Symmetry: C2
Subunit: 179 residues, 2 copies
């Protein structure tokens, strides 16, 4: 779904760069990638030079993604992306997941983390309140972090005003192309 | 052996507090078993950052050693009383970062005292939490749970960790990080 430019970019940069430590060559899975946050995430991932794996909910959205030159475009309405990506990666998986999918997608996305992997949950507390995670799934230096941008902005508005200026400098100096 | 011990302690504490934990000035960090090698590396790096340091240790003499370092709190690493104790001391706030090497009930009780935005860093080997589970509602206020296995990390990315250890040592050589004993 849509998000304003400031929400989309703050969410995607805090999630991929600060929490997710995304670095060149790493494999990132961005669910719902045609949405506001998803496209900010694909724009940032391209700046960093990560390998980009995506999903979306319609043929037309998926077609828009195949045109961006990414490694993988799967269906956000199914959990088939997990096996598809393991197949594609010869068992590696991905280094960071930026998740906005509900239910089985959370467990499957945690399952396909590589060693050192970072799972970032953007869903509302609703989505995972009942859910539990087995800590054995994080043992190979992996992590699970929730990002609630509304809360973060409420608690640290100065820090996020500064981060927005930082991100926009990258736009102004041509480092970050807004897609 | 001495050079290696120091590199493991400092790589563990710096990757955990600075890279994974994003520790920043004035944040509250809980360092368990703070008189151990990694624990002391983390106290030293927390002092460099200007965090507010909460600690535990397992004897009276080790607790006294920590009280002499000038930290906010020294509690018992063999009890889960620290969780209530720190909530009382911080008037309900809890802590921003937990650097955990305790097994058992201390893992759930340290996750419960994370502030919003809090980061729990688990240093135990896998056998410590192999059948442990975490309700994800516990992470809802922008919180996170990260395992750090430095042995694994060194196998996987040796050049990156060589660069990090050089950075740390340069910081110490230049007086920016004081190694505490
Ligand atoms: Na705009
Ligand atoms: Na979609
Ligand atoms: Na799918
Ligand atoms: Na695992
Ligand atoms: Na205990
Ligand atoms: Na914070
Ligand atoms: Na949440």
């Amino acid at each position: 779904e849509a998000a304003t430019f400031g929400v989309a970019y703050l969410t995607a940069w805090h999630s991929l760069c600060e929490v997710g430590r995304l670095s060149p060559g790493e494999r990132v899975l961005i669910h719902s990638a045609t949405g506001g946050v998803g496209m900010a995430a694909v724009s940032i991932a391209k700046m960093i030079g990560a390998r980009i794996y995506t999903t979306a909910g319609s043929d037309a959205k998926r077609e828009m993604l195949s045109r961006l030159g990414v490694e993988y475009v799967g269906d956000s309405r199914s959990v088939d992306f997990a096996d598809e990506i393991l197949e594609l990666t010869d068992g590696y998986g991905v280094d960071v997941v930026l998740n906005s999918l509900a239910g089985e997608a959370i467990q499957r996305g945690v399952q396909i983390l590589a060693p050192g992997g970072r799972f970032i949950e953007l869903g509302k507390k609703d989505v995972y309140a009942d859910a539990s995670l087995g800590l054995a799934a994080l043992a190979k230096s992996a992590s699970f972090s929730v990002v609630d941008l509304d809360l973060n902005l409420k608690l640290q508005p100065a820090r996020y005003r500064q981060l927005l200026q930082h991100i926009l400098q990258h736009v102004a100096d041509g480092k970050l192309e807004v897609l």
